[PDB]
Design a protein around this nucleic acid. Sequence first.
RNA 1: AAGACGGUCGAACUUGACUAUCUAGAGGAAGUAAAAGUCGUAACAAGGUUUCCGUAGGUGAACCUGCGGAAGGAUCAUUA
RNA 2: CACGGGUGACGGGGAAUCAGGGUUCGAUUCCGGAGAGGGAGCCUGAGAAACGGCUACCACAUCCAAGGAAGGCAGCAGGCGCGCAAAUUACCCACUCCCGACCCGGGGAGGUAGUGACGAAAAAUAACAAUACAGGACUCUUUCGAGGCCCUGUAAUUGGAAUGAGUCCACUUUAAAUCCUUUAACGAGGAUCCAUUGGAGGGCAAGUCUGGUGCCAGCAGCCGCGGUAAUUCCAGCUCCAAUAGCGUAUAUUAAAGUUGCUGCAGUUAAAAAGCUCGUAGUUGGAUCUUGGGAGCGGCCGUCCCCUGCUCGGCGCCGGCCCGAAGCGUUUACUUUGAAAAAAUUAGAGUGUUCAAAGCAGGCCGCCUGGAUACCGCAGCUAGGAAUAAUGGAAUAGGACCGCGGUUCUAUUUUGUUGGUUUUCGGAACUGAGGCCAUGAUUAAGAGGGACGGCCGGGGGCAUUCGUAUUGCGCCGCUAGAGGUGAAAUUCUUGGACCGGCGCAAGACGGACCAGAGCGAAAGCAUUUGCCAAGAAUGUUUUCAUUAAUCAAGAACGAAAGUCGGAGGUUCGAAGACGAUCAGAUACCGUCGUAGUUCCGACCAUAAACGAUGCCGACUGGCGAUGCGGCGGCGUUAUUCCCAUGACCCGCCGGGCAGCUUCCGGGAAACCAAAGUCUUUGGGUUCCGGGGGGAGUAUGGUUGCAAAGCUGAAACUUAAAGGAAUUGA
RNA 3: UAACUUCGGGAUAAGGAUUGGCUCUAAGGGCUGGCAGCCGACUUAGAACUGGUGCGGACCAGGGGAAUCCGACUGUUUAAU
Lengths: 129, 149, 141
Amino acid sequence: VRMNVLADALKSINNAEKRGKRQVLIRPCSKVIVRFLTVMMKHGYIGEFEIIDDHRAGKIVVNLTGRLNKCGVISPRFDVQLKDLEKWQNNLLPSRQFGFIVLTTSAGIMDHEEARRKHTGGKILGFFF
Amino acid sequence: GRMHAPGKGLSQSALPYRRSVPTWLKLTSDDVKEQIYKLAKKGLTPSQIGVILRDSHGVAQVRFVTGNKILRILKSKGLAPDLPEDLYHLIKKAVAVRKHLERNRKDKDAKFRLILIESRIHRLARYYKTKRVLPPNWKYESSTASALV
Amino acid sequence: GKCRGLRTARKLRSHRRDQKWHDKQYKKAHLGTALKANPFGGASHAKGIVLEKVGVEAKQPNSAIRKCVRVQLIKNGKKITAFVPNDGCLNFIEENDEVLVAGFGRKGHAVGDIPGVRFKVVKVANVSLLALYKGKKERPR
RNA sequence: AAGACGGUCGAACUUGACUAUCUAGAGGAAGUAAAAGUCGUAACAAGGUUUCCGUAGGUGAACCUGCGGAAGGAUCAUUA
RNA sequence: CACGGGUGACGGGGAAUCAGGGUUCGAUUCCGGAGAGGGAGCCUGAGAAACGGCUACCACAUCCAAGGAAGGCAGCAGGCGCGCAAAUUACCCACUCCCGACCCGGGGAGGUAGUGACGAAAAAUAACAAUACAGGACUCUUUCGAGGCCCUGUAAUUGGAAUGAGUCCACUUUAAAUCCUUUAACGAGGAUCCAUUGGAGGGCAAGUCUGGUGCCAGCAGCCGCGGUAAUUCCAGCUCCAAUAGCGUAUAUUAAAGUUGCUGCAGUUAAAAAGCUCGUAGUUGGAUCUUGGGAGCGGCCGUCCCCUGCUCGGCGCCGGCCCGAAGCGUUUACUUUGAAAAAAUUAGAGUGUUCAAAGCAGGCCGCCUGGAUACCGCAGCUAGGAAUAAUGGAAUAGGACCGCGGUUCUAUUUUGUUGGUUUUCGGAACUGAGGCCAUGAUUAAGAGGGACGGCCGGGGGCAUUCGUAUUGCGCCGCUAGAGGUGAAAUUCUUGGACCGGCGCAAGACGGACCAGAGCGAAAGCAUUUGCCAAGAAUGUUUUCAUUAAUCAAGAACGAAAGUCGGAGGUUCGAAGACGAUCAGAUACCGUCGUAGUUCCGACCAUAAACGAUGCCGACUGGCGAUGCGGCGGCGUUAUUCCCAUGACCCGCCGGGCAGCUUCCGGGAAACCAAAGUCUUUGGGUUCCGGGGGGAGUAUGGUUGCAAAGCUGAAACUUAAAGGAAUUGA
RNA sequence: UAACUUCGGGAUAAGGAUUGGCUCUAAGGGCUGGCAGCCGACUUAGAACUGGUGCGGACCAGGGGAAUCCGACUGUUUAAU
Ligand SMILES: [Mg+2]
Ligand SMILES: [Mg+2]
Ligand SMILES: [Mg+2]
Ligand SMILES: [Mg+2]
Ligand SMILES: [Mg+2]
Ligand SMILES: [Mg+2]
Ligand SMILES: [Mg+2]
Ligand SMILES: [Mg+2]
Ligand SMILES: [Mg+2]
Ligand SMILES: [Mg+2]
Ligand SMILES: [Mg+2]
Ligand SMILES: [Mg+2]
Ligand SMILES: [Mg+2]
Ligand SMILES: [Mg+2]
Ligand SMILES: [Mg+2]
Ligand SMILES: [Mg+2]
Ligand SMILES: [Mg+2]
Ligand SMILES: [Mg+2]
Ligand SMILES: [Mg+2]
Ligand SMILES: [Mg+2]
Ligand SMILES: [Mg+2]
Ligand SMILES: [Mg+2]
Ligand SMILES: [Mg+2]
Ligand SMILES: [Mg+2]
Ligand SMILES: [Mg+2]
Ligand SMILES: [Mg+2]
Ligand SMILES: [Mg+2]
Ligand SMILES: [Mg+2]
Ligand SMILES: [Mg+2]
Ligand SMILES: [Mg+2]
Ligand SMILES: [Mg+2]
Ligand SMILES: [Mg+2]
Ligand SMILES: [Mg+2]
Ligand SMILES: [Mg+2]
Ligand SMILES: [Mg+2]
Ligand SMILES: [Mg+2]
Ligand SMILES: [Mg+2]
Ligand SMILES: [Mg+2]
Ligand SMILES: [Mg+2]
Ligand SMILES: [Mg+2]
Ligand SMILES: [Mg+2]
Ligand SMILES: [Mg+2]
Ligand SMILES: [Mg+2]
Ligand SMILES: [Mg+2]
Ligand SMILES: [Mg+2]
Ligand SMILES: [Mg+2]
């Protein structure tokens, strides 16, 4: 059955970006998905999106640019200290100039570079570049 | 897919976005639930109380006209059946299969389905014991299940 | 990995143990069956007494008589076949004397054209066999 | 002080039982490896009876046959 | 994952290897445990179940006058033994400490030397000049040849200079010595004061040199060399590698993404259980606090606020501001703090002559060092509140807000003694209230259940029909009929085969029948009836997470086979005979037993196959087909038009497949999945680790048996194998 | 308490210990009006002491184990070899 909605959302975006489409429909919606794309939004990887409100788990239509190479999810959500963060980004990012690890902290869902900027560990969610 | 079948069916009811009440419906909440009351005394599970209300009386969803749902109305009054209806209909079916299987021992398919049906009884029974609508010692006995229909 | 839960460390760990026993090199080092089958008992060298001097045929493509010696170990009494390595060195080995034997190169596996020998002679009568070949030392009489 | 009844801890010996390793054995039956051995030709082509799986019987030996499968077949097809 | 067993198991601080992860080792100097040949029992003592204390027994062993006595090196040396495998029966309490009545005595603790290629650091075996030459940039020069201002190398050519290896006066060192350091005198020409260990076919740096051997001797980790021109053996010459070191054997680490958490594989190379159910285990849909303002800066970036209910101090006028104490869903997570032995590792300083080290040192008495980081997990502490768990009020037995009492009861209170009730307080029990916006998220392209019309060789029971086959009865006419490649066995004037009419028996269900359907799979096909079940579709019905995959366990599981009965037409293991053949215990032919059929019980295996786990999401088209539903021109029935049937044109949802494709993947064949994988993480189960031995031995368990399930090792071997290509 | 097994047996398998006398203790029930009174009958377990180690003191009262052959077994048979 469906087990991790964020895993389905990012796999769906990655297939449609890989085939060159312009919009994607994300079938289930949640606060974690909406908060994850707003992180990808702030760095210019995707365009602006829109969540459709049926009285159930809503849908999302996301405008795509041509800038996304891969978005992914890490399962399970491991916990990561500030000591482990350099090793995680050594494994699953292309280079040291671009690419981001999104990881939820008590301060909120937010990517790795500035998660280090306010000195908080967290739980790893995924990556994009 | 189905729990005890390989089919993957998608047919289901689709509830409309507007959860208001239509203007052409004139029944108010109080006389709808007395309409529900007298249908319970005719002898009817909540499943078909709501069926004969949305095709002859026009109430699309009882939970939209009132604030409550049908089975919640009944036990708030005292007319709820003793054991839940979905568990009741499994026991009723497993009794029929068990009786038919008893008269001809060579019905292997009947024996296979009876395993499946009595499996669904136990899966559902321990759910109702976690939500505490059955006593914690309630058990399904194949011999005595005939008495309670 | 196939199972990827946070609370599946017992599953993953206890599956390594089972599947490590199908590794051939792991299987023999961590069982006592291989160690007790070793004539040396797990040592690198062993000394024994010469029983007789024998020569074996080599193998299908080759054709030569491999000069060997049948030696009986001291710590066990087990009888093995060792190979007097170099050219003509078999003369220096006589019956009823003490020799030092070592493995022949491949950890208990047969090597080259000699069929079924795991051992080699390095010293006879407490004087190095390579020194006798080079003429640097002579047999202690 | 020696010594003595009793109690307690209890070595040790005798016997028995269980258990682990190692080892002898007439004869029997395998496996591997050498080889210009004897008898056939079973598998490779439609390998000259297409091959293979399961099961049962039989035969110097490879094998043969009966029943039900498979194509990894030698047919992706055969006409109102 | 108890209990039992094994450990070539004393635990730890640590060691080796290492990208990131890990793997292996820790007898070994520091901490902790245990033991003194094996057990057991005690005395003294603060402290012992002590053994350089005692008493027994067992083993071993010493002296003896034969009566008795004595013993415990896993302390320092040393010896035997075992072994592949490990040092002197040396000097001293001078240093470090410890013991005693003690400044004074003692210490095989410990220190110092001897052996010491375990291993680690430094570092000689030549340097330079001149001639002869050879090259190079230069010039002249057509080159050649020559000028050397400029080199660069080489040459058992010549030449003077510089040293330490060594011998050794002394000093220093030291408890006394030794070593190092300092320093006199000797001490280098083939500076013989002489560098080795492995290789030269490939991997892998480096001779097709010469002599010998002739598949012999030998070499070779692997591939392989060697049979009269050996680049590989044995030698000489030359060359290569490392260099006071190098080779070989063994354990182990990396290489090994060949144990895969990071991170492998399961169509055909080794591999997914026959099928479903199923408990532990693992994993689980959405859903509840946004936002606003102060301040600074270039719409933008940083600082701040959005829990309350006894004691004092910014104090002011019983109230207000703050500080302190107690109280307040629980965790996981994250950041901080404390607490964490040194030694080792990382690391700061410092010219041990550098370095490995060491904790020292520097300046003309003074000045300073002896840092710091890391130390998982578990326990403690303080902030954060995203993510993930978890609880509240639904027979209200719920919050609050005060009033009505009962009981027990702290204690204030009647100037000082005494008895009672108050009130004031505390705790518990009990009435009537008001008040809350009074209290139940939604209704998953999750699931369960209900309901409606259908659908299907799905299942069981009974029933019915059909020819055909074999046999039998009668009738007709006849000499052959059957079989094969050809024949024979076989039947035949006692009438076979053939034609006709009947009867009986047991099987079987053609053609229709399809890359159609139903079922969990195995499987399911004459008619009719009965009984129970099911998918999909339709649904503005109901419950509201009840779910997914699943060790152990359970139901079904073709054919064959086993056991009881009944029946036995055909076919037909075994067997028999006739052929063929070199043989023919076969293929071909005739006969034919068990079986093939049914009922009731076992067995649990198949190429039980799609050689392809299940659940979920996403990613191209096109024409079909089956079921259900929806809509539309028009034909055709009923007829009497509505509506249902049969065609036709589309749309939707499940299903069996098909064609095409640079989606993408793959070693490829090929696959719309076998894709969404080095851009590697959706959940979960089973399962492979070169080929054999071998699904074998043994043990256990199931079965009447046949056999099923679980399941090694010794030993052997450089390949076995998959897809495709060219030949034959 | 073994091999084996037709899972019923083998089996009292095999092999060990105890046993007297005396003096006590505890447990095991009725009837009448979680209590009280009045009645009882035999057993089992445990303890102390004690005897020239003696105790199922007479009587009664299975020797056992490992294999082979035959007949499955219970049963019957040549009154007088
Ligand atoms: Mg399931
Ligand atoms: Mg052949
Ligand atoms: Mg043939
Ligand atoms: Mg053939
Ligand atoms: Mg074939
Ligand atoms: Mg045969
Ligand atoms: Mg030990
Ligand atoms: Mg240790
Ligand atoms: Mg001790
Ligand atoms: Mg000793
Ligand atoms: Mg002692
Ligand atoms: Mg001693
Ligand atoms: Mg001592
Ligand atoms: Mg040594
Ligand atoms: Mg001293
Ligand atoms: Mg002194
Ligand atoms: Mg010492
Ligand atoms: Mg020298
Ligand atoms: Mg050579
Ligand atoms: Mg080489
Ligand atoms: Mg080379
Ligand atoms: Mg070589
Ligand atoms: Mg390794
Ligand atoms: Mg690696
Ligand atoms: Mg592999
Ligand atoms: Mg395979
Ligand atoms: Mg399968
Ligand atoms: Mg969730
Ligand atoms: Mg430390
Ligand atoms: Mg038909
Ligand atoms: Mg199972
Ligand atoms: Mg069958
Ligand atoms: Mg049968
Ligand atoms: Mg039968
Ligand atoms: Mg014949
Ligand atoms: Mg026949
Ligand atoms: Mg199988
Ligand atoms: Mg398979
Ligand atoms: Mg992967
Ligand atoms: Mg293997
Ligand atoms: Mg070879
Ligand atoms: Mg194969
Ligand atoms: Mg017996
Ligand atoms: Mg016999
Ligand atoms: Mg008898
Ligand atoms: Mg008689």
